[PDB]
């Protein structure tokens, strides 16, 4: 009876490595809840278990509050202090109440609350101790297969889930099968599956390589990037600081044994291992393997790279359904355009001709001088307007007066282009002039400007009949806007 | 107390041509007969026309 409480507390404390205090607090809450259910009225109840005897006293708790909303469970601070002057806001006032007999009903409630406390203590501490597993490749047994997810048993009442998107496209699991996967997220669904496991994401590939390649687990080789088409093909980029170690050779292993072990665990996924380079162009050449790259052109402003390949290698460089270029682009972070050497030259000739036409049209220069600007690397009016004067003065035949005139023309061309578009639609010119009339939304200003009504004066000159075809403009609203425009233009 | 089950023609299954079949629900435990009888007696004669 008495000594049995101590023996139970000691057995549970030792078996679940849990603080005795946390078990008692929970038993007190369990007994309070079991007591509340025996009364027809909603009462507040505190239970206190004596830590030496295992005896327990049950109260009618009265949550000491400032304002009473529930007179059956709450008492004012003034009324609580009339019974005991030591009470504060948030304390409990008690009332001698018959403790519930410990029948198999309370026993079952106590068992359930202990089990729940162990899930939030023993199992929580087990998950904390398995900080590596929360991130590394956990191993589970398939408990249940549904259409949209697989429930894994990890042991110790821990359940994990693999979602349909987190599976490989050709995997078929049965109840009782062993499955490995990366624990990529821990949420708070204690009842059910709080653990989310992936086999499809790139982290599964990284951690399989960490286990299979000791040199990655020892931090001698680093995986810098991983790009993956799950169950089909992946690319990994590897670097080492030790010049004595070939990082690609280490990840492949003797006759490919290491990469084949990882591929086999991923259902026969093809894995390319590439050397990481700190030069983006050299890294993209490595990422494009097994296709040979002839030339690369880098557009830093668009964050894009044009990759020229021999006409025989084009199909290999793109890969089946663009898989090779897509995985290389995801691995590099660059947008990758794969074309032939002939197509790259034709593209550059078309861009050079478009730049020459743009410069000839807007800068009032001859085609010979526009060609020199494009040969010196200028492709946009913005570059010519904003580039440091020193770079323009390095061009053979440019003097300081001609560079100043060229920049002034480029700025005036940029200004004119902006103003023209802003007046054609409703970007700025018609979004201020035509939209001056109270009531003009940006859409209506662009609809007006599409009819050639670009200014508040142009609107003041219109009839209702001239605007009657504008979708969303009633004759009354047209008349009001024309009168508002006339009031500002002719009577302001 | 004056609130009844206001009915409606849930479907008009007009079978073929010059022939319909109009079903009305729901009525009270006794109003199907009084509306069927009222509409039956009025359509039979009251309804005018030329021949």
């Amino acid at each position: 009876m008495n000594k049995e409480i101590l023996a139970v507390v000691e057995a549970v404390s030792n078996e679940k490595a849990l603080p005795r205090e946390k078990i008692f607090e929970a038993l007190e809450s369990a007994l309070a809840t079991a007591t509340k259910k025996k009364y027809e009225q909603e009462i507040d109840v505190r239970v206190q278990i004596d830590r030496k005897s295992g005896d327990f006293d049950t109260f009618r708790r009265w949550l000491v509050v400032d304002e009473v909303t529930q007179p059956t469970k709450e008492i004012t601070l003034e009324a609580a202090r009339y019974e005991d002057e030591s009470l504060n806001l948030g304390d409990y006032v008690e009332d001698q109440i018959e403790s519930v007999t410990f029948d198999r009903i309370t026993t079952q409630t106590a068992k359930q609350v202990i089990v729940q406390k162990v899930r939030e203590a023993e199992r929580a501490m087990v998950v904390d101790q398995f900080r590596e597993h929360e991130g590394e490749i956990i191993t589970g047994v398939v408990k249940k297969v549904n259409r949209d997810n697989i429930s894994l048993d990890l042991g110790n009442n821990a359940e994990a889930v693999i979602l349909r998107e987190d599976m490989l496209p050709r995997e078929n699991f049965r109840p009782g099968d062993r499955v490995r996967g990366v624990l990529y997220s821990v949420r708070p669904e204690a009842r059910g599956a709080q653990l989310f496991v992936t086999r499809s994401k790139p982290e599964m590939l990284i951690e399989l390589f960490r286990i299979e390649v000791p040199e990655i687990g020892e931090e001698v080789i680093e995986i810098k990037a991983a790009a993956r088409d799950p169950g089909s093909r992946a690319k990994i980029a590897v670097k080492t600081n030790d010049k004595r170690i070939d990082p690609v050779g280490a990840c492949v292993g003797m006759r490919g044994a290491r990469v084949q072990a990882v591929s086999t665990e991923l259902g026969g996924e093809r894995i390319d291992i590439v050397l990481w380079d700190d030069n983006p162009a050299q890294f993209v050449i490595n990422a494009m393997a097994p296709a040979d790259v002839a030339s690369i052109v880098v557009d830093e402003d668009k964050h894009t790279m044009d990759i020229a390949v021999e006409a025989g290698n084009l199909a290999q460089a793109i890969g089946r359904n663009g898989q090779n270029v897509r995985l290389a682009s995801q691995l590099s972070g660059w947008e990758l355009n794969v074309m032939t050497v002939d197509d790259l030259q034709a593209k550059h000739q078309a861009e050079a001709h478009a730049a020459i036409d743009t410069f000839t049209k807007y800068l009032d220069i001859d085609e010979d001088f526009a060609t020199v600007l494009v040969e010196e690397g200028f492709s946009t009016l913005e570059e010519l307007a904003y580039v440091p004067m020193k770079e323009l003065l390095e061009i053979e035949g440019l003097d300081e007066p001609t560079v100043e005139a060229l920049r002034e023309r480029a700025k005036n061309a940029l200004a004119t282009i902006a103003q023209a578009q802003e007046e054609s639609l409703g970007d700025n010119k018609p979004a201020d002039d035509l939209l001056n009339l109270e009531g003009v939304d940006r859409d209506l200003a662009f609809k007006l400007a599409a009819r050639g009504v670009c200014t508040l004066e142009d609107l003041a000159e219109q009839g209702i009949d001239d605007l009657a075809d504008i979708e969303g403009l009633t004759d009354e609203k047209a008349g009001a806007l024309i009168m508002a425009a006339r009031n500002i233009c002719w009577f302001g | 107390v004056t609130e009844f089950l206001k009915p409606r023609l849930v479907d008009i299954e007009q079978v073929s041509s010059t022939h319909a079949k109009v079903t009305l629900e729901p009525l009270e435990r006794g109003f199907g007969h009084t509306l069927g009888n009222a509409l039956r007696r009025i359509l039979l004669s009251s309804m005018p026309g030329c021949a």
């Binding site: 009473v68 909303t69 003034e78 | 009222a38």
Partner: protein
Amino acid sequence: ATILAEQLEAFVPEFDPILLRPVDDLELTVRSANCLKAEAIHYIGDLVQRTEVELLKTPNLGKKSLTEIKDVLASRGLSLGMRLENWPPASIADE
């Protein structure tokens, strides 16, 4: 249906009146009612102006009787410490 329907168209600021009630109408325990009468609280409008801290100073008013008064006032949508401007109305000052 049109014929049959045409053949039938010749046939077819001190709260409110609750504040003016005596405290005895609140169904309080004989203890709570006698404690309120000893402090000259006759109407519900007088009771609603008193704070919980003031009622606890009343001789023989316990924490239990204060909880009863709150639960009963709450059942009528009233709370302790409401300020009524112009209470008592001149209609009550002559009894």
